[PDB]
Structure formats: structure tokens, C-alpha cells
Symmetry: D2
Subunit: 456 residues, 4 copies
């Protein structure tokens, strides 16, 4: 072990670790559950420190040697070299201070080594004085939250959403000619094509993309520069804009400094709103997944209008039972996003005065929902959606088995007469044609020429 | 009526419509909280009247109120209970969080009415006083919470439970009636091993029986009353026997096991009893959601769905029977789920000596009880009692499935059985047709060996 | 009225009170769905009337309905809009999930009323027919969803937004007015570095401005109407120009930018536009919750709380001013949160061509709009406009804190400043008293160096 | 790598791993997020397999050599020797089949080695035929869910709840004599003792324990024996009761076989109900945590009636700022439990016919809530509750600064006169005594003898 210290005294930290006294102290005070900061957030925090170092250097507040060393240490984190250096639980200080310090200590200790120094109290780079220069945990954590959120939405969620939409759009086009029985209130209704039904799914996904895009501008606003309470006390006048620009450059995302730092520090409003669009997407996906598994139900005693790829092995003596597992995984994660929204809403509604201190929990839920939806759509697309195929025989069997087509006969025979054969078919368990012919109201030839499902 | 009456309070005089029994404070509240359309539920109004009726009786017993004043207030409360003054409580749910305004609403109405009952008049020259007489030995802080529990316990005991038991009985009868009807099972929405319709329905019965016990376990906490704790729970300004006597009186007149809360601080500072009780209700909502969904899917058709059962057609596409009772029931189950979140939020928000999210909490709670009780009652009489099996459809499905292959194992071995199954599946044949095509058995043998009743 | 009228439908004859305008189907529904007390909101009833009014005009334009029949139906709808028939829609929210029963309720009322308007009579010998005339070119499946969006968009545009903008303006005025008042900051509920009251309030303003934009972004999806998609979205049984013309007509008469939905399948199969729009509302509820809480805590007292501001006392312990407007507002914010869950559940539950959780979804949505609009209106006029700072209290707090020590750093160095702070904290002294005790500076110097205005 | 296979063919699995073909297949098909099965569930599943092996042996369905080998492999899992052998995500098959197979493969491969055999297709113990004998994924997963839930509630949650209650009960007793100002609607109200206020917290915790205990009997019912659809097809008549008894013996918990297996398989009702009591506890804890942090707010511009231990270091120049971090961690996890309840409710309401397939998600949320509440109460107790101390001076200052005590004077002077001095004190900013004396209504001696706060 090694001995690191702070204003409360010294504490032993494992020698093979880059964190310091404050991280070790929190590690012993917040032993709650198993949830830790996700990688995306660790990376966003590293990026925030990297940008702060550059700007501080530009303003002459930090020496080139230290500034470059810090950025290099930050790049190592981004490169996956220090994943084991962030052991803190989500259930910590509500402001995220301890994760801010965790990063400050890891970066300082490593930066020291990079400068021919050593980790520990003999270090050349200081966590608070150097790595956290011109910052406050108060404005740093919210900044990291927005960076991680916007990048996750732009880099993961949106591309996956686009891909699944394209796949489903191809399917609607491919099945544009297949007429099937409609179902309203779960009952047989008027026909529509399989392609039309799928176009509904496509339109839902397209609308969702638009909604998600509308939430991005607010998430792009950064708190950095607000300092402790939003006033900006102890910062160079250009710091907030400069750091926002630097972040935009290195991430290639349109980040801007929050026009009102009081709103930025005192609330998690951008995320409460952005998540609203995410629970909206969860509801749409749930409906799509449900339609797929119900339409694929069977093989003999369900609907069975479509078939989906069998991805897991099944019993030799049970050929036919294909459980819609991708659909099951998708509906389960959709329920999760709904629950996650409630946790975020409660935390978001609970800020007091100058600062909202429910942040770690809010970001934990938000990033998980993005993760679930992005990976969920990817998995559903590759292992299910791309392989949806119609069971043409079943579809036609059902179509010709229903009484819904009697409508076409009305245009060629009085309402009551057409309804009459429908009553007999229904009562006798006969098909529309069998009933029609047996009732002697028409012949096979004229019936078949009158009942054209493809003409709606 | 356009004519007004000038009533007044600590803040001054204000006009009240002459034909109304409320006073100055109710008028002020009415004018300051014009938010939405939700008002106190009738059940809560009655619970408040009962609370005032009990407080009066005890105040009389303790020599705190005159016999005449006490009997007049008691009589006025009975009129409220008889439904003679439903038009006298115009306050919105979105008022003061302690429910103080509704407490005063009852105080003013009962005071003005009791005055007339004593040969007096309503208004500032009334013989009975809202605060001094009707609210004697009480506080809005401890009155509203008490009214909340009185309404909640009575609604659960008199409405919800009986309806739950009735539905359970109906389903139990159906379970026994269809005990011999074998149908195809469905897991993951896929065809599965057989079970009888009676066994499937018995699961619904067991769900409801389990729910009943959970609801019963929540009742004792709701039976605890805050009355007597006054402003902050210390019971400052009350007779030492008051809290106990008023609880006894309420118990006597309601025939419900009401008891004074052992810790008045917990009683005034939280809505914990209701947060927990509602947890049992959202559990019932989840169970009902599943039962209702099973029913509508099982009855889907008439030709392109499952169609194993038929349900009563209540409203006027020959066989298109929309499962409307199931639709009303599933919709209200979602409502109960949302109501739970609103209740949890309000329950988690108490500060120091008092939880001030009470009108909202009771609004949601009583709504969930109404929805579940009436929903079960409607679903039972308009759907459950008339559920009938479509035996022909059930048998058609059973015989067309590949799931009965299992019965052949002991007769021809697993390998041949699996071969028959694979062939039927690949060629779109029934098990019998595939079996006969292969020549592994005769039709007579298939008929004798494949007995779905021995699943 | 005890006297009945015999009305009939496909299912037969049923008695309807003679003094009512509804018909057989509304009576059946009324008797089958006696669940709770929630009925269709007035705003939804009016939206339905508007929808029927537009459908009639277009049917006339397309030569589908006679000029006389069309004008009579149009006139009947206007009466509904004028509030002349609020007693004619008794159906509960807990009915058929497609809203079919409320569609028929409007059809029957408009048919019976239009008949009288044509010199005819109500009942089975009416001149205007519910289905053939009033529901011409329509389906319950596409009518209810349309009425939902008409009500939702109008409520958001005419009620919610204006009230939001007004509150924002009031707070902005307060922000500018108190721009020079320095107060102690509070992070984690602990004393923190100073900021002005004006800056703190500007955060509330920015929150409301941001909320307005989010709400605006949700409007175009709500503006899409399902009318014309008929039973399953294919538009079977309608004129090819119908969907477009009816949307135009509604747009003309409402002055709202209504458009026909580009994909009718998405329109009939989901409530996605409302699930998303409500997401913006629950966001506003979270912001309002924080603003309301800040106000009540800042005004807590009068002696043992924060007491930095004073709020208007609206109802009648000398300085005990309960923050009732804040209490009503925080309670309704919890309601909006719960409503969101109910909406999400119903929205996620569509099956195939139709979402049948509609009455429940619109019930919750319109309630959240009413609550937020009226809540902001009430909070603004009865609280926000009269917020005043307690300058003496604010200054007392500032001077008693240890947070101003920072201003001494540039004059005496960090080490001495920290020493003064530690001493004051350990001994329960003010910074000045500790500074003077140590002799690090004179009172004149402290007074000149510690300028809170330069924070 | 090694080559394992199933009915879909062969697939390579890392040689140094004990899982098989089906686990490897799922690993590639369900790459969703980062959530995996928690240790408590893995252990419960191992325990379920251990019990099944014993009973199967007792009924002669399995040979002693294989049965003992399986139990030994199971014990190794319980001992923490194979944590890295369960890589499957929560977002998998809704029935939990893939986790059931993961355990079957790990146990079979290891059991083979224990019998002088080898892992892989050459194994002496077979995953399906031996380890899963007399079972079905359908009834095995629900059983594992209940075992993990009941044990977590009994072994972790309840003891922590009891401990925190005892600590707070000691505090109420200790501060039974300290009179303070009450607060209703956040406004100054009539006095009560600090001990009384704390007794309220104690009573809340005691009521919650009762509620949690009421939910245990239903959770104790096990699905094992129901088989695929609840009928029990393919099992010895005594199997269900025997396995339930065995489980009771090895865990020392009162497990019983579910009286109705259809209810047990088709729903997650016991957990929906049990979680109801947990969200109830979250609401109570939230209120307690909030009271503590508000009462400790300050040090100069808040309430400051109590002080709590400072666990993290602070600025040298800012002595006094003690952020209530344990309270912040506790309120954050409470919001989480509320959100978790919604996800569970949606999954619980979504069963279809014979089986509810939202199980992995339900158990994931349930176990997390237990974890959060148990660890949260432990942390709050040790690092905050045990160290709550009153700031007697502040408490008295506030008490004597309020106008609420004017009530005592009423009993010694007319309502209006007492109210009169209250008006002056309030208007002039004077204390009750200063106003009373200046108004000449009484003397210091008689005032002090009349205004006795300790007499309520």
C-alpha cells in the first residue's frame, strides 16, 4: 500500500492504484450496491478535464508542461488504459464531487509520472491546484453529464434508430402486395397489406427520430464556467466560452456554454426533457415488438402470419416452437426505460436553491436507457427484423376464412342478402363462398370475381 | 341566487351566495384556488362529517360542548351523510396541502346548519360557531388525516373487498365447470403442452385469493387515526382521554376496527399507511390486467384469432364481438399504476411535523378504490358470469398442433416420434397424417394412444 | 323526468329518458359501464362536436350530404359548442377503448337535435340519422383519435402556453427588480458563495423559457389528424380528397395548424404524439416543482426558517403565512408525474391496427394541461406578482455567515483568512469579531474590504 | 478455444471456461448493455440445482455419483469459485431459459471433471439430461427468483432495518428532554421535543418492518414442480414438495411449494406485492433523510438544530460547510426504488396465458432495490445516524426567538393582550419578552415563570 493524505489526515491506498486519499475515503463511506460510473461518463469526465487543461494553458493559468501531461493522462483514460481506476459507486455525493475528485487524483498521479515524477504525495501535478484549476465539482459534473449524454445520443442511439428504420422500410416495400386481415380490438377487421402495416412501424420510428433531435439543443448547453453557484466567481471571463469551444472541437459535437448557468446548475431539466423522448421511443418499440411476436405466434394455435429467425436451439421432438426471444428482450428493456423515467423525474424535480444534488442517479438512469435502446434496436434489427418473412399460405387461409370480405358482395347484392350468407357461414361454420353457394345466391365464378381482397 | 350574505373571518368580510351554507373561509378558498375540476370525493366528505359527528359526541361526554349544541351539530352531520348537502362542498383538491380549507368548509356548513336547527339563522349571527364549537378539541392538521383513513378503510371494506370476493367466486365456479376441457397451452405465445381450461382459470382464482390476503394485511395500518395529535402530534390542547374516546366512537358508529394511532408524529408527518395500502392495490391492478388480457385474447376472432372462448355481447361483421368490458378494465388498471406514482411522490415529500400533499394523495387513493371495485363488479356481471368455451374450436386447435407428439414416445420411441413431428412440421401436416404417411402406426392406434386427457 | 322514450338499435329497443337527446347506444353504454365518476372532459366533447361540424361541411362540399341535413347538423354542433347540451354526455371514461361509445353519443345527440331543427322530432322517427348522416364518411376508430388531437392542440395553444408566458414575464420583472440584492447561496442545503436574488430568479425564468421551447417542439406531431383513415387506416369507404379537406376545414374554423396525418396506420395504431407531448409536460412539472419549493423555503418562518422573502397572505401565530399556492402547485406537479406513467402504459399497449386505451390517455392528458395552466395562472396572480425581499433578514444572514471570508484573501493572504474563519466557526463569532479579536485588521478595513456586491 | 455443440451445430467456446454451446450462442445474440445476473441470483440458481439433484437421487432418478458431483459443483459456485462463468445479460430470454442453461452447462462440465472426466462434449455429466432432470426453464427460473428474493429480504434488508431502528430509538431516548420549535407547512408551529420528532422516524421504520414481513409468505411459495405449463407433466408426484423441503433445509428459510402452479408460472405477483412494501420503505426513508439534512442545514444561514458527522475533507478556508452526503446518497437510491417499482409493475402486468416472460427484468430490479435499501440503511446508520447530535444553543435561540410561545401567556392574560405583544414583537422585530416588557404588560420574572416551553 501507499500513504496519501488530505485535510483529514493520511489514509493508505493500494500502491498499484492511481487514485488518492479522497477516492479511498469515499470507497469506505459509500459501499452501496454494485453500480459504478459507466465508461461513457468516465470518458466524458476525462474529456472535460482535457479541455479545461488546454484552455487554462491558453489563458496562461497553467504551465505547458503540466497542461500537456494532464491531457496525455486524459487520453490514456479514453484509450481504456485505466478502467480499474474508478471504483466509486453511483450512490455517492449528490453533486458528483467524489467522482470529480477521483478523476482529479488519477489524472494528477499519472501526470506526475509522465513528468518523470511519481504518484503519491511526492507528485509534481496536484489534483486540486492543477487538474481542477478554474473548476468546481458543482459545474464539472453537470458538464460531464451533458457531454456523455449528447455523444451517446448522437453516436449510438440515432445511428441504430436509422438502421432499424431502413430495414423495416425495405420490408414494407417488399410486402406491399400481400393483403392480410386487419385487427382492431383484437377482432377481425377490414383488410390492409402487410406492407402498409409495416409502414406504420416505420412512420413511428421516423417521428421518434424527429422528437429525439428536438431534445439535443438543450443537452448541448454546458455548465462549465458557472463555478460554485452559477456566478462564475474565480474564472477568467472567456473561460466558459473557450472551454465550450474546445469541447466542441475535440468531440466534433455542437457544444455551447449554457446561456443561464443558474438554470444549468440548479436543475437537470435538459435530461428530464430528453428522457421524455426516450420513454416515447420505448412505448413505440414495445408496440412494434409485440406486433411481431403476436404475428409470429404459433406454429399451429396462434396467428402465424409471419415467421422470424430461430436463433437458439430447440427440442428435436418439438420442431416449430420458435420463442420470439429478441422480442422478449426488447419489451423487457422498454419497461426498464419507463421505470428509469420515473427515477429521473423525481430527481429532476428535487433540486434546491443553487444546486440539484440527485445527479449521479439521474445520469446513471439516462445513460442506461440510451444503452438499452441503442443495443436493443441493434440486436432486434440483426437477429429478427432483417429476417421477417410472411407465411403466405397462412395469410391467405385466414383471409379466405374470415367473414369480413362479405362487404364486397354488398356492392353486387343488397346489404341484407349479403349479410344473410354471412349469418349462415358464421352459424354453420362455413366459409363465405360455401355459404353463398349453398344458399344459391351466386356461383363460384361470379363470387370469386366479386370478392377481390387486393382491391381493399 | 344572485343575493349575497356578508360573512366574515379574521381577514374581514366577504360575500357568500345567500342560498349556500358555507362561510367566509370557504368563499376565499373558492376564489383563490380555481384549479381544474377535481373536488373532494363524496366518500371523503362523508368521512369528514363522521369525524365531526364523533368529535361532537365525545366533546359532549367530556363536558366540553353543551348537550344542545352537540346534538345540533350531530344532526347536521347526519344530513350531510344522508346526502342533503352535496352542493355545499365546492372546494378543489388543489388547495392547501393539509386539507385545512376542506376542514373549514365542513366547520362552516355544520355551524350554519346547526344554528338553524337550534332555531337560529345562518351567517354572522349564528348560534353555533365553526371554530369554537364544531372544530372544538381539533386541528385541521389532525382532522384531515383522520378523515382520509376513515374514507379509505370503509371504501376498502365495504366496496373493494366484497366485489373482489364475488368475482373470485364466479371464476371458481367456471374453473370447476370446465375442469375436463383440455386445451393447448401457450408459453412465450407459442404452442405448448396441454392443460385444462379449468386449470388455467384456477390460476386467475389463486391470483385473486392471494390479492385478497395482501389487501387484508394493509388494513390495520389504515385503521390507525391521527385525531387527538392536534397541531404537531403532542396533543397539546386536548383532554387526555380524547384521542382514545373519539377513536372508540368512530369504531362504534362505523363498525370498523378504528384505533387511535400509537405514534401521532408518524400519523401527522406521513401518509405511510396509504402508500403501503396502495401498493397492494397496484398489485391487484397488475393481476386484473393479466386476467382481462387473457380473456380478450382467448375470445379473439371470430375467425382470425384464438377463439377458444366466447363472452357476452353487450352492445350492438356478424361475429365481431369487441371485448369492451376487458377494455374498460385494462384502462383503469393503467390508471391505478399511474396513481401509485403520484401517491409515492406525495408520500415521500413530508417535511418535519406534517405531510402537506394530502388532498392529492386521498384523491388518487379513493379513485383507485372506486375504479377497482366498480371495474370488478362490471367485469363480473357483464363478462365473467357468461364465459363459455368453444369446444369445437378448442378441439380443432388441439388436433392441429404438434404438441401431442409426446404421447407416442412410450409406444414407438422418441426417435420415431421426433421424425413424425419433423415431417408434419416441414410438410404442413397433422401428426396423424404424418404418422400414417410413414406407416409407423395405424389410425386406430393413433386414436387410442394420443389421449390429450392424460396430460 | 320519469317518462321514457323507446329508442332502438341493432340490438333492439331500450328506454331513454324523454327529456334527453341521446339514443339507444348511449343508454346501453350508460347501463353497462357504471364505473367510478370520471366522464369525458368538456374540452373533448367540444372537440368531438367540432370534428362532426367539419365532417358535415365537407360531406356537403363533396355532395355526400344534403345541404339541409348538413346545415342542421352544423347548427346542432354549434349549440354543443355554445354549452347548451353539457348534460347530454353521461358516458364514463371507462368505456370501450376506441372511444366508440362517445362517438355514438355525439352522433345520437346531434341526430336527434338536428331532426328537431328540421321541424322533426327526436326518437326513432327522426329526420336525421346518427350513423348514416352524422357519422357519414367516418368511423369511431378514426373519429376519437382526431377529437383527441383537436382538444390537445387547442388546450396547449389557448390555455397552457399563454399562462406559461405570463408567469415567465412576472418572474422576469422580479429578476430585474432585485438584480442588486446580494444574498447567501446554498448548495447541498449548506451556506455557499453569494449571488443576487435577481440572478437566482433568472434561473427560474430560464427554466420556463426552455420549457416553452420543448412544448412548442411537440405541437407539430399533435397537429396530425387521423380522420380519413377509417377502420384500419386504409381509408376504405371515403372520398380520396376527404382526409385533406376535413383537416383544412378544422384548421380554418379553429385557426390552429391542423394537417392530415401522413401515415394513417401510425395515427390509428398509437397515441405516440400524446406520449411525446406529455413528456414535455412532465418536464414542466419538474421545473415548476423546483420553483414552488424554492419559493416556500425562501419564505419559511417567520422566525425559525429562512425568511429571505415574503409572499402574499391570501387566507386568514401572528406572522404564520402558510404557502398555500405553493402547496397546490407542488401537489399538481406530482399528479402530472403519475399521469405520465398511466399515459405511457396505455401508449405502449397498442395491438395491430388500433390502440384501444384512448379514453384513459386523453383523460390524463387533458387533466395535466388543465392542472398546469390553471396552476400557473393561480400561482402567478396570487403569489408571483407579490414576491418581496426581506432586505433586513437577507443582510443579517449575509453578515452572520462565514462565506464572505474570501474577500480578505487579496488583502491579508489565504492563511490568515482561513485562521479567522476557523476561529469564528469554533467560537461562534462573526468574521469581523474573529478578525478584530486576532487583530489582523481594523473594523474600518473589514468594512471596506468585505464588499458582498463584488461577488 | 474448445468446440461444444447443440442441435444447431458446433460453436467454439473459450477453453478456459466451463459454459457450453447454448451460453456461447446467447452471448453473441444478446449483447445488450452491461447488466448481468447478480451474484445473489446466481447463488439461488445453484441452490435450486443442488436441491433438484438431491431429490432426484432420493427418487432414484439420478445416480449417486452424478448427484453428488453436481452438488459439489454447485457448492463451488456458492463458494465464489466460478463468478466469471456467468456472462449472460439480464436482457435475454424472458423466461430466463438461457441463464438456466448457463448454470446447466457450467455445472455439467465441472461435475464431469469432478468425476475424473473432462469438460466439453466428452463430459460424463450432461447439462440437459442430468443437471436439468425433472425440471424446465419455465419453473426453474421463477424458483430461483423467489429463493434469491426471500433470502435477500431475510438476510440483508430486515437486519439492517432493525439496526437503524435501534440506533434511532436510542437517539429519541437520549433527546427526550430537548424542546424545539415545531414546523408545519414549513412555518413555525407549536413545540415538541427532539426525542418526540425522532420517535416519529422510529415508528415509521417499525411499521415498515411489519409491512415487509407480511409480504414474505407469498414470496416463499416455489414454482418448482409445475414444469412447462403448471400441470407437472413429467415429474414424480412427490417431487414438488420434496424439492421445496430440501430447499428449506439447506437455506434454513420457510420455503413451500406453491399451492397453485398456474398462478406461480403465469405471474410475478408475489414480487409485485413485495416490492410494494419496498417502495413504501423508500418513501419513509426519503422523509427521514430529508428531515436530517434540513435540520443540519447551515452552519449559519439554514436551520442548524442538529449536527452530523463530517466524513469527507473540506476547504481549510471554509470550516463549517458539512455537506449531508449520506443523506444525498440515501434520497438518490430512494428515487431509484420508486422507478424500479414502475418497471416491475409493467412487467408483472404483462404475463400471457401460461407464462410471464418479463422475469429477468423483474428480478433484476427487485434485487437491486433490496441491495440499495439494505446497504443504504447500513451506510446511513454507521456514517450519519449514530452521530446525530443537537446544537442545544441554536435550538434554544430559535425557541426563544419565535412568537409561538405567546400561547402560554394567554392562560395568564386575555387573548388580545397576549396577541398584542406578539404583534409588536413581530412588527418591531423584537422578542416576545422584549415586546412584553416594553409594552409594560408584565415583568421579566413573571414572564419567565409563565412561558415554560418544557410544559408544551
Amino acid at each position: 500500500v501507499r500513504s496519501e493524505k488530505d485535510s483529514m489526515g493520511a489514509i493508505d491506498v493500494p500502491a498499484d492504484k492511481l487514485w488518492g486519499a479522497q477516492t479511498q475515503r469515499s470507497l469506505e463511506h459509500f459501499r452501496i450496491s454494485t453500480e459504478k460510473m459507466p465508461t461513457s461518463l468516465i470518458h466524458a469526465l476525462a474529456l472535460t478535464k482535457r479541455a479545461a487543461a488546454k484552455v487554462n494553458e491558453d489563458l496562461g493559468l497553467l504551465s505547458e508542461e503540466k497542461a500537456s501531461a494532464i491531457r496525455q493522462a486524459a487520453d490514456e483514460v479514453l484509450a481504456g488504459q485505466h478502467d480499474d481506476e474508478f471504483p466509486l459507486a453511483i450512490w455517492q455525493t449528490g453533486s458528483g464531487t467524489q467522482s470529480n475528485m477521483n478523476m482529479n487524483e488519477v489524472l494528477a498521479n499519472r501526470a506526475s509520472e509522465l513528468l518523470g515524477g511519481v504518484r503519491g504525495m511526492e507528485r509534481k501535478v496536484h489534483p486540486n491546484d492543477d487538474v481542477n484549476k478554474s473548476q468546481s465539482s458543482n459545474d464539472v459534473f453537470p458538464t460531464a453529464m451533458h457531454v456523455a449524454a449528447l455523444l451517446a445520443l448522437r453516436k449510438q442511439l440515432i445511428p441504430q434508430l436509422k438502421t432499424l428504420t431502413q430495414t423495416l422500410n425495405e420490408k414494407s416495400r417488399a410486402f406491399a402486395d400481400i393483403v392480410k386481415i386487419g385487427r382492431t380490438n383484437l377482432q377481425d377487421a377490414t383488410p390492409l397489406t402487410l406492407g402498409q402495416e409495416i409502414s406504420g412501424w416505420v412512420a413511428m420510428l421516423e417521428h421518434n427520430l424527429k422528437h429525439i433531435e428536438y431534445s439535443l439543443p438543450h443537452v448541448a448547453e454546458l455548465a462549465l464556467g458557472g463555478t460554485a453557484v452559477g456566478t462564475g466567481l474565480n474564472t477568467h471571463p472567456e473561460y466558459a466560452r473557450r472551454v465550450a469551444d474546445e469541447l466542441a472541437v475535440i468531440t466534433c459535437a455542437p457544444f455551447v456554454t449554457a446561456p443561464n448557468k443558474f438554470e444549468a446548475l440548479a436543475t437537470c431539466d435538459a435530461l428530464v426533457q430528453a428522457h421524455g423522448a426516450l420513454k416515447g421511443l420505448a412505448a413505440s418499440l414495445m408496440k412494434i415488438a409485440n406486433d411481431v411476436r403476436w404475428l409470429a405466434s404459433g406454429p399451429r394455435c396462434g396467428i402465424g402470419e409471419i415467421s422470424i429467425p430461430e436463433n437458439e436451439p430447440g427440442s428435436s421432438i418439438m420442431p416449430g416452437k420458435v420463442n420470439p426471444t429478441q422480442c422478449e428482450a426488447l419489451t423487457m428493456l422498454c419497461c426498464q426505460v419507463m421505470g428509469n423515467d420515473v427515477a429521473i423525474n423525481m430527481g429532476g424535480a428535487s433540486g434546491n436553491f443553487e444546486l440539484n444534488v440527485f445527479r449521479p442517479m439521474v445520469i446513471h438512469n439516462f445513460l442506461q436507457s440510451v444503452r438499452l435502446l441503442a443495443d436493443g434496436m441493434e440486436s432486434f434489427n440483426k437477429h429478427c427484423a432483417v429476417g421477417i418473412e410472411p407465411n403466405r399460405e397462412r395469410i391467405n387461409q385466414l383471409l379466405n376464412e374470415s367473414l369480413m370480405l362479405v362487404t364486397a358482395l354488398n356492392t353486387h347484392i343488397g346489404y341484407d342478402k349479403a349479410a344473410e350468407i354471412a349469418k349462415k357461414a358464421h352459424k354453420e361454420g362455413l366459409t363465405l363462398k360455401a355459404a353463398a353457394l349453398a344458399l344459391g345466391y351466386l356461383s363460384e365464378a361470379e363470387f370469386d370475381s366479386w370478392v377481390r381482397p387486393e382491391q381493399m
